[PDB]
Design a protein around this ligand. Structure first.
Ligand SMILES: Cc1cc(-c2nc3ccccc3n2CC2CCOCC2)cn(C)c1=O
Length: 127
């Protein structure tokens, strides 16, 4: 039932970087995905309590949402783009794992992933 602590968005020990690839992930990719009509269910951690999904965090052991990714990019938490791209891929994969094919949330995830792949193909080379 109980919601776990959200994923870490702050860690003063962890060394941080501002790269053009990370600037692109915030300014181009996240901005595009966040404003999409199907973004809202992905903008915050799954609230298992509110949704009465006591199973959710029994099945999903690496939760991720765009709220966390947004916080991680705004607060320069990442070392490289691969870390941030992994977070997006975890958010999509968690959706496909927990939910059934054809479910509304999976159709929303599929739309968002398509856009995400488009923008990631155009990832700038490291400056
Ligand atoms: C299982 C699940 C639920 C939601 C979710 N978050 C909601 C917030 C408020 C209200 C409903 C919420 N849901 C359920 C879906 C919302 C969109 O339509 C399908 C149900 C999001 N994701 C990524 C999931 O994997």
């Amino acid at each position: 039932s109980m919601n776990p602590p959200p994923p870490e968005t702050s860690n003063p020990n962890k060394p941080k970087r501002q790269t053009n690839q990370l600037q692109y992930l915030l300014r181009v990719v996240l901005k595009t995905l966040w404003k999409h009509q199907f973004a809202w269910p992905f903008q915050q951690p799954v609230d298992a309590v509110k949704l009465n999904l006591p199973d959710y965090y029994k099945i999903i052991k690496t939760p991720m949402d765009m709220g966390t990714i947004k916080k991680r990019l705004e607060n320069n938490y990442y070392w490289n783009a691969q870390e941030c791209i992994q977070d997006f891929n975890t958010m999509f994969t968690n959706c496909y794992i927990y939910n059934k094919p054809g479910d509304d949330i999976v159709l929303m995830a599929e739309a968002l992933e398509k856009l995400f792949l488009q923008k990631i193909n155009e990832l700038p080379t490291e400056e």
